[PDB]
């Protein structure tokens, strides 16, 4: 399923897991958001790649 946890990823907005779509900053080396933090506009100024859980 595409709506599952991404293993070994911690959201840099809330320090929790990333379930469903992972938002990986394309600029910073190691920055990721979960869908809630992404929806709140955290880190909005950088382009990210958004992809489902493998
Ligand atoms: N509590 C944290 N935000 N730790 C840093 C996580 C860095 C990066 N998002 C990763 O999953 O590897
Ligand atoms: Zn989060
Ligand atoms: Zn960034």
Residue numbers in the entry: 118 to 171
Task: Show the paper's wording.
Sequestosome 1 (SQSTM1 or p62) mediates cell proliferation, survival, and death through multiple signaling programs, including autophagy and metabolism. Structurally, p62 contains six functional motifs: an N-terminal PKC-binding PB1 (Phox and Bem1p) domain, the central ZZ and TB modules, a LC3-interacting region (LIR), a Keap1-binding region (KIR), and the C-terminal ubiquitin associated (UBA) domain. Following binding to the ubiquitinated cargos, p62 undergoes oligomerization and delivers the cargo aggregates to the autophagosome via interacting with the autophagosomal membrane protein LC3. Here, we report the structural basis underlying specific recognition of Nt-R substrates by the ZZ domain of p62.
To determine whether the amino-acid arginine, which is abundant in the cytosol, could be a substrate for p62ZZ, we employed NMR titration experiments. A free arginine binds to p62ZZ, but free glutamic acid, leucine, or glutamine do not. To elucidate the mechanistic basis for the arginine association, we obtained the crystal structure of p62ZZ in complex with arginine. Structural comparison of p62ZZ-RE and p62ZZ-arginine complexes reveals that the intermolecular contacts constraining the side chain and the α-amino-terminal NH3+ group of Arg1 are conserved in both complexes, however, D147 and R139 no longer contribute to the interaction with free arginine.Fig. 5 p62 is not a direct arginine sensor in mTORC1 pathway. a Superimposed 1H,15N HSQC spectra of p62ZZ (115–190) collected upon titration with the indicated free amino acids. Our results show that p62ZZ binds tighter to RL than to free arginine amino acid (Kd = 1.5 mM), however, weaker to Nt-R degron. To determine whether the activation of mTORC1 by arginine requires the arginine-binding capacity of p62, we reconstituted p62-/- cells with retroviruses expressing p62 WT or the p62 mutants that are unable to bind arginine (D129K, D147K, or D149K) and analyzed the arginine-mediated mTORC1 activation under arginine or amino acids starvation. We found that overexpression of the p62 mutants, impaired in arginine binding, rescued the mTORC1 activation almost at the same level as WT p62. These data demonstrate that activation of the mTORC1 pathway by arginine is largely independent of the arginine-binding capacity of p62. Taken together, our findings suggest that unlike arginylated substrates, a free arginine is incapable of inducing autophagy. We further demonstrate that p62 is necessary for arginine-mediated mTORC1 activation but p62 does not serve as a direct arginine sensor.
